[PDB]
Amino acid sequence: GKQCFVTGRKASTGNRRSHALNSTKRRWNANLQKVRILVDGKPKKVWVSARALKSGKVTRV
Amino acid sequence: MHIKKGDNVKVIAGKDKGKEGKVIATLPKKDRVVVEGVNIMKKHQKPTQLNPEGGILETEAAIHVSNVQLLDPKTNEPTRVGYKFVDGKKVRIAKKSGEEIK
Amino acid sequence: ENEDVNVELSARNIPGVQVTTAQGLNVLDITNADSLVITEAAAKKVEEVL
Amino acid sequence: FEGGQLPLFRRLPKRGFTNINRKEYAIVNLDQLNKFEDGTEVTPALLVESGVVKNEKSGIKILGNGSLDKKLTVKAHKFSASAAEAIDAKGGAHEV
RNA sequence: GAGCUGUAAGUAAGCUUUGAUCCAGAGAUUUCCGAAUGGGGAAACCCAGCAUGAGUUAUGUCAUGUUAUCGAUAUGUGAAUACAUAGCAUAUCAGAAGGCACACCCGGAGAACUGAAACAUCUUAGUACCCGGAGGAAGAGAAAGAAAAUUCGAUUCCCUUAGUAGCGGCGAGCGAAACGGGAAGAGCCCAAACCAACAAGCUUGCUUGUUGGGGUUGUAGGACACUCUAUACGGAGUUACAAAGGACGACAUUAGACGAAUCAUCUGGAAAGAUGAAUCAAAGAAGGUAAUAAUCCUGUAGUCGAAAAUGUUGUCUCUCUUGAGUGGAUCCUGAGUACGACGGAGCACGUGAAAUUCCGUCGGAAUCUGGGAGGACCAUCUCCUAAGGCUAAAUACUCUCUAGUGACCGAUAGUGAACCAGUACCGUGAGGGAAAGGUGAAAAGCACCCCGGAAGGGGAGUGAAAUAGAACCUGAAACCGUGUGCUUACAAGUAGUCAGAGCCCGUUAAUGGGUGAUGGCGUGCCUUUUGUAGAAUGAACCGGCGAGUUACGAUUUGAUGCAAGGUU
RNA sequence: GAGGGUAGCGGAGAAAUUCCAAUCGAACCUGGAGAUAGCUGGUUCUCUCCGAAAUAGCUUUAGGGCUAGCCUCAAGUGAUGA
RNA sequence: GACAAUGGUAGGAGAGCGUUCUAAGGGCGUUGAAGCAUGAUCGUAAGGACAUGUGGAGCGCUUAGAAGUGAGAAUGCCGGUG
RNA sequence: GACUCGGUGAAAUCAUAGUACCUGUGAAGAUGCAGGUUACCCGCGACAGGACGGAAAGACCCCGUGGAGCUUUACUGUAGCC
Ligand SMILES: [Mg+2]
Ligand SMILES: [Mg+2]
Ligand SMILES: [Mg+2]
Ligand SMILES: [Mg+2]
Ligand SMILES: [Mg+2]
Ligand SMILES: [Mg+2]
Ligand SMILES: [Mg+2]
Ligand SMILES: [Mg+2]
Ligand SMILES: [Mg+2]
Ligand SMILES: [Mg+2]
Ligand SMILES: [Mg+2]
Ligand SMILES: [Mg+2]
Ligand SMILES: [Mg+2]
Ligand SMILES: [Mg+2]
Ligand SMILES: [Mg+2]
Ligand SMILES: [Mg+2]
Ligand SMILES: [Mg+2]
Ligand SMILES: [Mg+2]
Ligand SMILES: [Mg+2]
Ligand SMILES: [Mg+2]
Ligand SMILES: [Mg+2]
Ligand SMILES: [Mg+2]
Ligand SMILES: [Mg+2]
Ligand SMILES: [Mg+2]
Ligand SMILES: [Mg+2]
Ligand SMILES: [Mg+2]
Ligand SMILES: [Mg+2]
Ligand SMILES: [Mg+2]
Ligand SMILES: [Mg+2]
Ligand SMILES: [Mg+2]
Ligand SMILES: [Mg+2]
Ligand SMILES: [Mg+2]
Ligand SMILES: [Mg+2]
Ligand SMILES: [Mg+2]
Ligand SMILES: [Mg+2]
Ligand SMILES: [Mg+2]
Ligand SMILES: [Mg+2]
Ligand SMILES: [Mg+2]
Ligand SMILES: [Mg+2]
Ligand SMILES: [Mg+2]
Ligand SMILES: [Mg+2]
Ligand SMILES: [Mg+2]
Ligand SMILES: [Mg+2]
Ligand SMILES: [Mg+2]
């Protein structure tokens, strides 16, 4: 139950593939980071993905 | 049922075919009727029961209602029954004479 | 020739009598029948169709 | 299956390709043209309606099998050299 | 409309024409457990707070209501810590919860036996199982589409394209789409530019934010400017396109009512059968009735019917609402998006020359002289206009209700269950899971006598039948007995067969039936084997049940129709 | 002794492949499910005509299979057979 | 009329018997259907009649159609009984 | 306990059985076949040579392109760590 507080960016599932094309299940996790932003006008430490943080589009306060 | 307690009926099927008698009881859930002097059964009665005297008792057993037919009030012939509405009341009519039965 | 309500209703209850139209003719009905009674209009319609 | 002997359709090789733009023509021979009255203008529509050609495919090609016995003006998408020569020799005309 | 107090008999006491029972609509009541919610708990129990009330002199006892958690909205209060923010307290809420139809839908996560005659890529299969979310359907949907002409014009679904094009240890196998033919059809709303009002920053410049207006696109549309048109005239509507109602009417569902027409004799326990003579039919569907009934009953065809509730609809009402054209100066037209790289996934397409589409990570545009697509890629041309949303129908399914149907079963079948069956029984539990139908037309269900403690029986009686007497229609076979015609105690037997006296019978009357002194010949059956009396296998016996089927394709043969046509 | 905890891709084991509800080299139940079985067994009425093979080749093949050889049915050829 | 053929496992080919159901036609049945039982009956086989007893209400036959269509064996399943 | 009597009363097994021996024959070790030899019919108490006796579809052996547990510098992977 871990996802980007801002965008909902979350982990996905897929395959790890060997050179012989054997397949094993794996996950791609989001690059989440615990940051303090303004939530409902109050500071709060939430999980935010690096991509949601990129270019200062989220205010850390 | 089209036959009613107190009606005078003719037996049209059975050992008692041709006998006439009064309907003295009906069994709606079995479609059966009891007619005087018709369908007499001899039942073995134990004197040891609540009735001291016992033996062979003769009494009418019920007959299927489709085996008795109403007698026409005028001609006294067996007749089927229809229904009329006189001043909002259902009246049984003999289909042979057209007269009210009761 | 076409659906004839009164003929259908008058023949319906007679055992052995079947009623059909020219369009409704079929091998089973014809073959089962001993006799066919066809109106002149129906006969002409059948002749046109076949 | 051949019980483990390499099967025929693996010991033999694959050959060729399929052309994406392949064209195939509905063919009509002169013997078939012989059914139209002399002086007729035979066209793809007339061939279809008359039932000589059922499926037009990429168009109508006239081929030279049989003998043409009538003078016609034939319109088709293609003609064999022999078909065109026979149509002309019978006094008729052809056009693509 | 005359009986009734269920199965379910009995007895008892009663009810009912002053209309019972019974049938349909509406309403009342509806203990306890259970999401279970005052707290607890080993479900159907235990233990409380608060308010009001009953009772007691008072305590003890009792009644009713209320008190879970989370969420949302308000109010008050308010820490570290000043301001107020945690927090805390109170009030409101038809807010949530839980269940299930073992179906259908969408999504998360996701096997293996198996096939490949081994096996890893591949297959089984995105199947089973698990989980979440629904809805009556869901999903999809009004082109950044399909294509390549005289172009088409949302989506979905059926036919066909076609086992084609393709994919593939190019193995096993996987396998489209567009066109064409059909079912059904319906189109819309925002964001932005711009305008007006309000509030903050107070340049008190005009920036930001909120509200309302405006606007919605490829034939580029709109803003903007101008010109016409109207304040609901018209138009539209609660199925999207905004959202609540009201009046009246119609129809339908949920009980019901009427409803034609046959008598006689014979047999028989009984007639519906047979025989004879009639009758109705918009009714000859069907069931029942003492055997097989159009005319006896229940019905059928046909016609009629609703106090009340529910459903679908129509008209009024109600509500909402302007609609076009011209211009090309400026402005707007969805950004961490499109797209790229890497790693995966999805596309019929396994990374491939891989378009088209999604996810993670990192990088990252253009702005109508723009942007996307036409299967790498570029040019040209052509078609579109992404990064916002909504949307009925055609399609899927069936726990259920109503009316019906079947060259479907008929008690070892058909449901596991025709019957008090998910029971009995088995298991700690999940869970597994049976056997068992038939008196008779009517209960008339055997008064009475006799033997016996009873059970059981013999009479008598009821009944057409008791030889139908209670798991009571029929009553096969294995198996067990009693009697007996022939036969057998010096004989070596797969048990019969062929020959044959004697004795006993007498038939579907046939150059008969039963038995068998004695003679010849002769090691069961099935399976499996080179070969089985085999001391190889199987069967205690009898009965029932128990194994090449169906669908869709292919091929061949026969048949039949038509034939350079044939067929949908 | 009582009340409890650890659960099967797992527990527990002073260690024996030892125990986990009377058989544990991986409990039990239900489901995928009719797994797969080139193996063994079984496969139900009758008569009539014809009537084999147990060989070659290849085979992760050797008690399996494929094509050929030998059987059968039909149509054709027509003396081509012994 | 003649004269030729007719052992047979796997297996091929053919013609048939019998079971349930359906269609149409034509019949039977309480003056006794099916089922069961017995018999010295008939057909080349599968099998088909007839009589009598039991039984007590249903059933043949002809042509065609359709199949849950034939059991002696599976350490077969269920029941009954040795 | 067995044995006899009164009461009660199973089981495995079982193709049908009127179930001798010898020498032979034979799927090469016969109650059942040949040729001889022996033997009146029916019980009861006992013994175990045979019925290749019953019990368990041999666990040894081999076979199946069967299963499972285990090993490793077999192959291909992978949790995890760097
Ligand atoms: Mg509670
Ligand atoms: Mg395999
Ligand atoms: Mg295999
Ligand atoms: Mg939808
Ligand atoms: Mg290869
Ligand atoms: Mg265009
Ligand atoms: Mg609306
Ligand atoms: Mg009536
Ligand atoms: Mg009537
Ligand atoms: Mg009569
Ligand atoms: Mg990629
Ligand atoms: Mg491209
Ligand atoms: Mg692109
Ligand atoms: Mg291209
Ligand atoms: Mg829809
Ligand atoms: Mg039975
Ligand atoms: Mg059953
Ligand atoms: Mg059962
Ligand atoms: Mg009986
Ligand atoms: Mg003697
Ligand atoms: Mg052999
Ligand atoms: Mg051997
Ligand atoms: Mg022996
Ligand atoms: Mg064996
Ligand atoms: Mg045995
Ligand atoms: Mg048997
Ligand atoms: Mg231990
Ligand atoms: Mg060891
Ligand atoms: Mg144990
Ligand atoms: Mg499977
Ligand atoms: Mg199996
Ligand atoms: Mg021969
Ligand atoms: Mg090889
Ligand atoms: Mg022969
Ligand atoms: Mg011979
Ligand atoms: Mg054959
Ligand atoms: Mg069968
Ligand atoms: Mg003793
Ligand atoms: Mg004793
Ligand atoms: Mg034997
Ligand atoms: Mg020998
Ligand atoms: Mg001897
Ligand atoms: Mg032994
Ligand atoms: Mg063995």
Which nucleotide across the nucleic acid strands is nearest to D4, CA versus C1'?
Answer: F59
The number of C-alpha atoms within 13 Å of B16 and in the hemisphere containing its C-beta is 22
* B101 close to B93: Cβ distance less than 8 angstroms: yes
Q: Amino acid identity, residue D55?
A: N
**Residue D21 DSSP code:** T
Of A41, A51, A45, the C-alpha closest to A10 is A51
Q: How far is it, in rounded angstroms, from Cα B53 to Cα B47?
A: 5
Cross-strand partners of D26: D60
Tell which strand E nucleotides have any atom below 7 Å from a protein Cβ.
1-4, 85-86, 108-111, 117, 120-122, 165-166, 170-172, 257-263, 269-272, 281-285, 288-290, 293, 296-298, 336-337, 343-345, 351, 359-364, 442-448, 461-464, 564-566
Both ends of chain B: CA-CA distance in Å? 15
Residue B52: Cβ-neighbour burial (10 angstroms; 0-12, 13-18, 19+) = exposed
Q: How far is it, in rounded angstroms, from Cα B54 to Cα B35?
A: 24
The token pair at A57 is 């589009």
Place of tokens 């033996």: B55
Q: Amino acid identity, residue A33?
A: Q
Place of tokens 């057209």: B98
Residue D69 included in any domain? yes
Range of the domain at B9: 2-101
Q: How far is CA B85 from the centre of its chain?
A: 25
Cross-strand partners of B11: B68
**One-letter-per-residue 3-state SS of chain B:** CCCCCCCEEEECCCCCCCCEEEEEEEEHHHCEEEECCCCEEEEEECCCCCCCCCEEEEEECCEEHHHEEEECCCCCCECCEEEEEECCEEEEEECCCCCECC
CA distances from B45 to B41, B57, B77, D33, D59 (A): 12, 6, 39, 110, 107
Q: How far is it, in rounded angstroms, from Cα A49 to Cα A47?
A: 7
Q: Which of residues 2-31 of D touch strand F (CB under 7 A)?
A: 2-5
The H or E element spanning position D93 is: strand D93-95
Q: How far is it, in rounded angstroms, from Cα B24 to Cα A12?
A: 88
Q: How far is it, in rounded angstroms, from Cα D96 to Cα D94?
A: 7
Q: How far is the CA of B5 from the centre of ligand 4 (A)?
A: 67
Q: How far is it, in rounded angstroms, from Cα C23 to Cα C3?
A: 10
The token pair at B83 is 């229904």
The token pair at B86 is 């006189």
CA distances from D84 to D62, D65, D87, D92 (A): 8, 12, 5, 10
Of B56, B91, B36, B98, the C-alpha closest to B73 is B98
Q: How far is the CA of D9 from the centre of ligand 3 (A)?
A: 21
* C23 close to C50: Cβ distance less than 8 angstroms: no
Q: How far is the CA of D87 from the centre of ligand 12 (A)?
A: 50
In degrees, to the nearest 5, what angle opens at C-alpha A51 toward C-alphas A46 and A6? 40
- Overall domain count for chain D: 1
Q: Amino acid identity, residue B14?
A: G
For residue D6, report the phi and psi dihedrals to the nearest 5 degrees.
-55, 120
In degrees, to the nearest 5, what angle opens at C-alpha C18 toward C-alphas C13 and C22? 140
Residue D34 included in any domain? yes
Strands B40-45 and B55-60: antiparallel
The resolution, in Å, is 2.0
A56 CA – G13 C1', rounded, Å: 92
Residue C25: Cβ-neighbour burial (10 angstroms; 0-12, 13-18, 19+) = middle
Of B42, B33, B29, the C-alpha closest to B14 is B33
Q: How far is it, in rounded angstroms, from Cα C11 to Cα C20?
A: 11
Residue D74: Cβ-neighbour burial (10 angstroms; 0-12, 13-18, 19+) = buried
Per the document, the length of chain D is: 96
Residue D45 included in any domain? yes
Q: How far is it, in rounded angstroms, from Cα D94 to Cα D78?
A: 10
Q: Which residues of B18-38 are buried (b: 16+ CB within 10 A; e: fewer)?
A: ebbbebeebeeeeebbbbeeb
Residue C11: Cβ-neighbour burial (10 angstroms; 0-12, 13-18, 19+) = middle
Of B41, B30, B38, B40, the C-alpha closest to B8 is B38
* C41 close to C3: Cβ distance less than 8 angstroms: no
Which nucleotide across the nucleic acid strands is nearest to B48, CA versus C1'?
Answer: E447
Q: How far is it, in rounded angstroms, from Cα D20 to Cα D41?
A: 34
- Overall domain count for chain B: 1
CA distances from D40 to D35, D51, D82 (A): 10, 16, 20
Q: How far is CA A50 from the centre of its chain?
A: 7
**Residue D5 DSSP code:** B
- Overall domain count for chain A: 1
Q: Amino acid identity, residue B92?
A: R
* B42 close to B58: Cβ distance less than 8 angstroms: yes
Interacting residues of B2 by C-beta distance below 8 A, sequence separation 6+: B65, B70, B81, B92
